[PDB]
């Protein structure tokens, strides 16, 4: 193909991109795309680049943005991205993360468990009704996206109406946030972000009118109290960005977890065990299918960086192929074997041999929602396993095409009565 970004976006590799990634890792581990964007596919390089973000790598400066992203000036989505905390280093990053971190702590995620349980039981009850009638159910549409959408809305300060009203817009924006995005895709993303901006403009007034115990209300109060703690552009970027991160990747992990259950029935037993056993299954789900193969966030080299025979020049945009690092045999031996024991009894995300899964990133931009995602999976997956021992696929799952995300359009299932 033209470059690795073209290969990953190609239909031929949409079903199982990991053979291409194995090819890339083995033949061009420090890949230089046609546009000059680099892509690291080895776990060791990826881990280094993530951990070294702060000095060796930084988010784009104003100069970098104009140089590397000449459209950013006429792209609503790129300009919104430029002011998210994922593009920043301390002290700016510290200030912005400090404003949102409380809502995502272990303690605050615990407070969401009653809602997670109630949504899980409510939706699975309706789903069990249809399945028992012999119906085919699109589990992605009626559960996988529904649970994280509703839980995120409660945390964030959105009504259930708003989040369903924007799911379509959110997914079109997401697809525009990658180098290979077509002019058509980026235009639609820009239009959808103005819509999202329109919604938040209204939501902002509502939460200024009636503050409540949600994230949007605290950001607005922090901004309204003092926009040098959170500027106008930082506020809208934060609202936009957290919405983009708030459920799509979590739903993808629920989808992939269900497929793992069906594909590896001998490993479903892990979901019947104690908390540590359930968590271990979910960590292996996260290693096996990172929902973002690489991250939309650019990392700009602050030095000329020589890696083996390849030199990344100062100022170059470097991306990290998280999904390839997760299946890099140097970090995870026999990497295509699905085995929850890799993460059983260890620190979250850490293998028994001391190698981290990369699906949540690492370093200063380590995923803020990691506990939120893990806990939703930990609550719902054992209930799904116990309720449908005879779940089977009813046709092939339909993936949503994308250059970098691993989401689904459908996960059709039925009950096997035999």
Ligand X SMILES: C=C1C[C@@]23CC[C@H]4[C@@](C)(CCC[C@@]4(C)C(=O)O)[C@@H]2CC[C@@H]1C3
**Interface residues toward ligand X, by CB under 6 A:** 84, 86, 174, 177, 241-242, 244-245, 249, 292, 295-297
Tokens representing 226 are: 């003092």
CA dist., res. 358 & res. 366, Å (int): 9
The entry of ligand X, ligand HEM, none that residue 360 binds, CB within 5 to 8 Å by partner kind = ligand HEM
**CB of residue 265 to ligand HEM, shortest distance in Å:** 23
208 backbone dihedrals φ, ψ, rounded to 5°: -75, -40
Interaction partner, residue 244 (ligand HEM, ligand X, none; CB < 5-8 Å by kind): ligand X
| Of the candidate residues 245, 325, 349, 397, the single one contacting ligand HEM (CB under 6 A) | 245
Q: 299 labelled as ligand-binding?
A: yes
Under rule CB under 6 A, residue 356 binds ligand HEM:
no
Interface with ligand HEM in residues 310-349 (CB under 6 A): 322
Task: List the structure tokens of 294.
Answer: 């690489």
Residue with smaller CB distance to ligand HEM, 24 or 368: 368
Which of the residues 132 through 191 are near ligand HEM (CB under 6 A)? none
Q: How far is CA 248 from CA 133, 137, 140, 175, 372, in A?
A: 30, 20, 11, 11, 13
Q: In the range 265-294, which residues lie near ligand HEM by CB under 6 A?
A: 291-292
The answer on whether 380 is annotated among ligand-binding residues is: no
Contact of residue 177 among ligand X, ligand HEM, none (CB under 5-8 Å per partner type): ligand X
Element (H, E) at 410: strand 408-410
Q: Nearest approach, Cβ of 20 to ligand HEM (angstroms)? A: 20
Whose Cβ is closer to ligand X: residue 136's or residue 370's?
370
Q: Calculate helix-pair angle for 370-387, 113-132, nearest 10 degrees.
A: 30
Is 295 among the annotated ligand-binding positions?
yes
Is 359 marked as a binding-site residue? no
- Of 303, 301, 297, the closest CA to residue 320 belongs to 297
Q: Which is nearer to ligand X, 24 or 174 (CB)?
A: 174
Pairing status of strand 38-40 against strand 317-320: parallel
**Which listed range, 227-235, 246-254, 269-277, 388-396, lies at the site for ligand HEM (CB under 6 A)?**
246-254
Give backbone dihedrals phi and psi of 377, rounded to 5 degrees, phi first.
-65, -45
**407 touching ligand HEM, by CB under 6 A:** no
- 151 contact choice in ligand HEM, ligand X, none (CB below 5 to 8 Å, kind-dependent): none
Instruction: Please give the DSSP secondary-structure letter assigned to residue 414.
Output: E
**111 has binding-site annotation:** no
Instruction: CB nearer to ligand HEM: give 131 or 157.
Output: 157
Q: Please state the three-class secondary structure of 24-84 as a single string.
A: HHHHCCEEECCCCCEEECCHHHHHHHHHCECCCEECCCHHHHHHHCHHHHHCHHHHHHHCC
342: helix, strand or coil:
helix
Instruction: Return the number of the residue (242 or 384) whose C-beta is nearest ligand X.
Output: 242
CB 224 within 8 A of CB 231: no
Q: Is 93 annotated as a binding residue?
A: yes
- Choice between 124 and 253, CB closer to ligand X: 253
Whether residue 385 contacts residue 268, with contact meaning beta carbons closer than 8 Å, is answered with yes
CB 174 within 8 A of CB 242: no
Q: Which stretch binds ligand HEM (CB under 6 A): 19-27, 183-191, 206-214, 364-372?
A: 364-372
Element holding 206 (H helix, E strand): helix 183-209
Nearer to ligand X, 217 or 249 (CB): 249
Closest of 271, 298, 266 to residue 283, by C-alpha: 271
Q: Which two tokens stand for residue 65?
A: 């943005």
Among 41, 75, 185, 295, which residue interacts with ligand HEM (rule: CB under 6 A)?
A: 295
253/251 Cα distance (integer angstroms): 5
- Residue at shortest CB range from ligand HEM: 369
Q: Which residue is nearest to ligand X (CB)?
A: 241
- State yes or no: residue 365 binds ligand HEM (CB under 6 A): yes
- The residue among 83 and 217 lying less far from ligand X, judged by its C-beta, is 83
Q: Please give the residue ranges that form the binding site for ligand HEM (CB under 6 A).
A: 85-86, 97, 242, 245-246, 249-250, 253, 291-292, 295, 297, 322, 359-361, 365, 367-369, 372-373
Binding-site residue positions for heme b: 93, 97, 295, 299, 365, 367
């Amino acid at each position: 193909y033209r470059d690795a970004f073209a290969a990953l976006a190609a239909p031929e590799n949409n079903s199982n991109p990991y053979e291409y990634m194995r090819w890339l890792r083995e033949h061009d581990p420090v890949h230089r795309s046609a546009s000059g964007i680099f892509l690291l596919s080895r776990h060791a390089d990826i881990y280094w680049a993530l951990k070294a973000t702060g000095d060796t790598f930084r988010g784009p400066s104003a100069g970098d943005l104009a140089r590397l992203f000449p459209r950013a000036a006429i792209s609503r989505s790129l300009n919104l991205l430029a002011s998210t905390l994922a593009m920043k280093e301390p002290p700016t990053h510290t200030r912005l993360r400090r404003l949102i971190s409380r809502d995502f702590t272990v303690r605050q995620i615990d407070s969401l468990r009653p809602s997670i349980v109630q949504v899980t039981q409510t939706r699975l009850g309706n789903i069990a009704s249809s399945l028992e009638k012999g119906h085919v159910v699109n589990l992605h549409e009626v559960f996988s996206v529904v649970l994280p959408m509703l839980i995120f809305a409660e945390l964030f300060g959105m009504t259930q109406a708003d989040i369903f009203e924007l799911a379509a817009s959110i997914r079109t924006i997401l697809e525009g946030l990658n180098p290979h995005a077509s002019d058509e895709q980026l235009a639609a993303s820009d239009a959808a972000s103005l819509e999202v901006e329109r919604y938040f403009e209204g939501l902002i007034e509502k939460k200024r009118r009636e503050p409540q115990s949600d994230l949007v209300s605290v950001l607005v109060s922090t901004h309204d109290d003092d926009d040098d703690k959170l500027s106008d552009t930082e506020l809208i970027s934060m609202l936009w960005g957290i919405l983009l991160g708030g459920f799509a990747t979590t739903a993808a992990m629920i989808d992939h977890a269900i497929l793992d259950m069906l594909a590896f029935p001998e490993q479903r037993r892990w979901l019947e065990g104690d908390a540590a056993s359930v968590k271990a299954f979910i960590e292996e789900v996260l290693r096996y299918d990172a929902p973002a193969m690489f991250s939309s966030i650019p990392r700009i080299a602050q030095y000329d960086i020589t890696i083996g025979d390849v030199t990344i020049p100062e100022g170059a945009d470097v991306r990290v192929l998280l999904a390839s690092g997760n299946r890099d045999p140097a970090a995870f031996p026999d990497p295509d074997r699905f085995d929850p024991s890799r993460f059983h009894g260890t620190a979250p995300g850490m293998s028994t041999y001391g190698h981290v899964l990369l699906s949540f990133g690492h370093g200063i931009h380590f995923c803020l929602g990691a506990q939120l995602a893990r806990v939703q999976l930990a609550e719902c997956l054992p209930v799904i396993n116990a309720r449908f021992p005879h779940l089977v696929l009813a046709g092939d799952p339909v993936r949503e095409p994308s250059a970098f995300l691993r989401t689904f359009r459908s996960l059709p299932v039925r009950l096997d009565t035999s």
